[PDB]
Amino acid sequence: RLVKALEDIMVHYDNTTRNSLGNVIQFIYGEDGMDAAHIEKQSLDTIGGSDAAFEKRYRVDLLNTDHTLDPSLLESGSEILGDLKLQVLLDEEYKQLVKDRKFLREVFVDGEANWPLPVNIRRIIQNAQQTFHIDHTKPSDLTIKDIVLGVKDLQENLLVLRGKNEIIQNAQRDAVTLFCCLLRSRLATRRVLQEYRLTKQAFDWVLSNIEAQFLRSVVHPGEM
């Protein structure tokens, strides 16, 4: 009986899910436009943890000698101590990590951090680390702006809906919110330099891959 009731629902090339009448059952399939074969359980890091621990891991304060990026992390490290306009960006990234954590604690009241999402970022990073033979003993040549603005730009290309109007834009941004929290938590500045140690070249490859993989997770029109 369930097969007879659902048999006609299909995904359409607008990404909507509809019955044989064309009625809308869902405005995007699964609320996220993904195929469930391309989704894996990942932990959303912002959500858990004490407030002290979250601010050791993610806060970069370039105006403070205790709380900046050690210069062994980064080639620019000496030169960014006390720099005021980088610290504006980095404040903006932290404010976004902070909101992220609050948002997610309202979504997941319980605190459950592990949830299926597309694009297994940890395994892309571990690959980048093998593939670029990455020495944990050398500052990286990544810059602050490379990270910060590179991660913002990537979000603009994780596309599930493509319509030029506002409405479709909002839908697009709502579709990709939770993946974008996972993303900003994983590629935040202090993690990229201090935990992952990426180079520029590795980091650039991490991104372009997250993007290809994300795009290949989108469900295909026509699926029943």
Partner: protein, 83 residues
């Protein structure tokens, strides 16, 4: 009721279903002695030919995608990204 080439809002990636149906329509025609567009660097098997065709982007076909309300977009095989 047709949607101009610009302004197209559906994916630029080919879907598994389009891919399957392409390869298979083209191998049907290869199988009935239709002219081939690609170098047979050995292959005798029509599906396999077809796929080399798809890979060299030499399959001159167009996918007409209907939207639920009757309107449609035309995407050429050439242009669809194959991932």
């Amino acid at each position: 009721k047709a949607i101009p080439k610009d302004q197209r809002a559906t994916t630029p990636y080919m879907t598994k279903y389009e891919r399957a149906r392409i390869l298979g329509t083209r191998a049907l025609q290869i199988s009935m002695n239709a002219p081939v567009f690609v170098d047979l660097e050995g292959e005798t098997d029509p599906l396999r030919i077809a796929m080399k065709e798809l890979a060299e982007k030499k399959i001159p076909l167009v996918i007409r995608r209907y939207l639920p309300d009757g309107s449609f977009e035309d995407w050429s095989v050439e242009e669809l990204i194959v991932d």
